[PDB]
Design a protein around this ligand. Structure first.
Ligand SMILES: CC(C)[C@@H](C(=O)N1C[C@H](O)C[C@H]1C(=O)NCc1ccc2cnn(C)c2c1)n1nnc2c1CC[C@H](CCCN1CCCN(c3nccc(-c4noc([C@@]5(C)CCCc6sc(N)c(C#N)c65)n4)n3)[C@@H](C)C1)C2
Ligand SMILES: Nc1nc2c(ncn2[C@@H]2O[C@H](COP(=O)(O)OP(=O)(O)CP(=O)(O)O)[C@@H](O)[C@H]2O)c(=O)[nH]1
Ligand SMILES: [Mg+2]
Lengths: 163, 86, 146, 101
């Protein structure tokens, strides 16, 4: 059994903790912590190590190498927060810096897809995720909509990256 | 204005003075013909090529090509490059 | 003394490796330490998101040789005008014939076999003085004393 | 756009430059300015093909891509009752030391 360290990056209040809480416990509800769950993906039992990033922003040698350990990243934004979509670029810059590679298994995630007033169109996120060469998935931490899809597709990106 | 640089095997290289002035040794020794007692022709011919490469790209604002050096000349050229101070 | 300013003001920059070498971008942090960045293959370009007042220099990725950016050894991004990027062109410098010969010999002889050569002892030392960046930061500060 | 060349005859070699649009005869005036021989008594060769006095250096194969300053192109020279073009080779480099193989 191989382990897959997954990191969840994003802006404040986009549902980074809420996404992990459903993937771990199927139990939708508060600090930077790491969670582990054994799941079967593509008929293959593997261990998931989810680190929900949180707190103030910091670029220390501690925090850099802590993010370096992750094998794949979820870049999460809220569809009703325009800033969270236009912030995705900065998270990808730092991911590519600490991993020291322009090809890192990543996936753009649009959460909070259960609210009526969306301010970020789906076309904007498809044109952005195409420029990064990464998959895009609309999720909802309230209804489990694509919560398995968002996490499982990243594991396929890491298994593809294996050279 | 051209100066004359003679190698150890009688090969004389005619090169402009401002190009030969790159060498700190050649600069001090001149006063129109310069002889070399232990630098062969295949080494002095390459040094004269560096003089052209030097003056041509020393203030170039664009990209500059690499100066090619073959392995069979690299060791002998380093001795000549050391003596000439260029 | 040679350090980046903590401006927190973004500035999009384009790095361009117009050298036949693999270029190593070196960022001078706010404390003056050189921090390397992902390398650039020969003949490539990248849209870097740097910040105003940040110091940059570029070296050969392997041999740590010196390289020029816009015909100078340092790069500070300005402020972008009308959203235009800022182009940093990386070229080879005119290496002295002595230094170029050293680079070629360093790439063909293992450092354990430097002393097995038939060169003079003055050159045996020059071979083992591989370029370090700290001595280059030390001189560059002394060079800008005016 | 300049073209960088080596004018070689016997054990002599001239390192000079010229624009690609300049004439072969114009180059013979430069050779005359070093080697005291008139252009009527000169015969320039690119490899072993006689260069016509009216053509430009580019019309002879000399381009800034094939005639770089760090690797200039060779032009044979014959003086005059003309001689046969004779370029003496340079010295030969020594065998590669075993540490550099
Ligand atoms: C400190 C340096 C990073 C530096 C800097 O950027 N430089 C220095 C040279 O000029 C070049 C430039 C740089 O590196 N370009 C990127 C790059 C990439 C590849 C290549 C290849 N070649 N080159 C040359 C490259 C360059 N620098 N200097 N001044 C500043 C900075 C960084 C930014 C500072 C101010 C930003 C303000 N923010 C606050 C508001 C919200 N925001 C926010 N809110 C919460 C969290 C985060 C966040 N961000 O990342 C992360 C994670 C967790 C994920 C992910 C991996 C890591 S790792 C680590 N430690 C993390 C953390 N905390 C993270 N979470 N973001 C973001 C969007 C803006 C001003
Ligand atoms: N409607 C809706 N609300 C959601 C969803 N996911 C999270 N939220 C809401 O977002 C708020 C904050 O989300 P949270 O999971 O704490 O996000 P976070 O990115 O971990 C915030 P921090 O970075 O500060 O830890 C909560 O009020 C929660 O109810 C979702 O899918 N739909
Ligand atoms: Mg949280």
């Amino acid at each position: 059994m191989t382990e897959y360290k997954l990191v969840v990056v994003g802006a404040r209040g986009v549902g980074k903790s809420a996404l992990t809480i459903q993937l771990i416990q199927n139990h939708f509800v508060t600090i930077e912590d790491s969670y582990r769950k054994q799941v079967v993906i593509d008929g293959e039992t593997c261990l998931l190590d989810i680190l929900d990033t949180a707190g103030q922003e910091e670029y220390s040698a501690m925090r850099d190498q802590y993010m370096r350990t992750g094998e794949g990243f979820l870049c999460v934004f809220a569809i009703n927060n325009t800033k969270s979509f236009e912030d995705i670029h900065h998270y990808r810059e730092q991911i590519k810096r600490v991993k020291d590679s322009e090809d890192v298994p990543m996936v753009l995630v649009g959460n909070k897809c259960d609210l009526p007033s969306r301010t970020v169109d789906t076309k904007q996120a498809q044109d952005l995720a195409r420029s990064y060469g990464i998959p895009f998935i609309e999720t909802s931490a309230k209804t489990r909509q694509g919560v398995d899809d968002a996490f499982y597709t990243l594991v396929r990106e890491i298994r593809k990256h294996k050279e | 204005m051209y100066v004359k640089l003679i190698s150890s095997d009688g090969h004389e290289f005619i090169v402009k003075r401002e190009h030969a002035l790159t060498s700190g040794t050649i600069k001090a020794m001149l006063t129109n013909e310069v002889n070399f007692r232990e630098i062969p022709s295949h080494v002095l011919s390459k040094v004269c090529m560096y003089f052209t490469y030097k003056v041509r790209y020393t203030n170039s604002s664009t990209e500059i090509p690499e100066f090619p050096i073959a392995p069979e000349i690299a060791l002998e050229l380093l001795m000549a490059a050391n003596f000439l101070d260029c | 003394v040679l350090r980046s300013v903590n401006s927190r003001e973004p500035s999009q920059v384009i790095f361009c490796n117009r050298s036949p070498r693999v270029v190593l971008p070196v960022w001078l942090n706010f404390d003056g330490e050189p921090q390397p960045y992902p390398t650039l293959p020969p003949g490539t370009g990248r849209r870097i998101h740097s910040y105003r007042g940040h110091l940059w220099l570029f070296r050969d990725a392997g041999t740590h040789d010196g390289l020029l950016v816009n015909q100078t050894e340092l790069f500070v991004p300005s402020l972008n005008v009308d959203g235009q990027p800022i182009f940093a062109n990386i070229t080879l410098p005119v290496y002295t014939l002595k230094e170029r010969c050293l680079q070629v010999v360093r790439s063909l002889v293992k450092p354990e076999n430097y002393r097995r050569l038939d060169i003079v002892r003055s050159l045996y030392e020059d071979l083992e003085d591989h370029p370090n960046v700290q001595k280059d930061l030390e001189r560059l500060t002394q060079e800008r004393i005016a | 756009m300049d073209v960088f060349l080596m004018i070689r005859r016997h054990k002599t070699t001239i390192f000079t430059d010229a624009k690609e649009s300049s004439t072969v005869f114009e180059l013979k005036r430069i050779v005359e300015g070093i080697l005291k021989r008139p252009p009527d008594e000169q015969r320039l060769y690119k490899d072993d093909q006689l260069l016509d006095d009216g053509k430009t250096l580019g019309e002879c194969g000399f381009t800034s891509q094939t005639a770089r300053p760090q690797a200039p192109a060779t032009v044979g020279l014959a003086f005059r009752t003309f001689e046969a073009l004779c370029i003496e080779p340079f010295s030969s480099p020594p065998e590669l030391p075993d540490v550099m193989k």
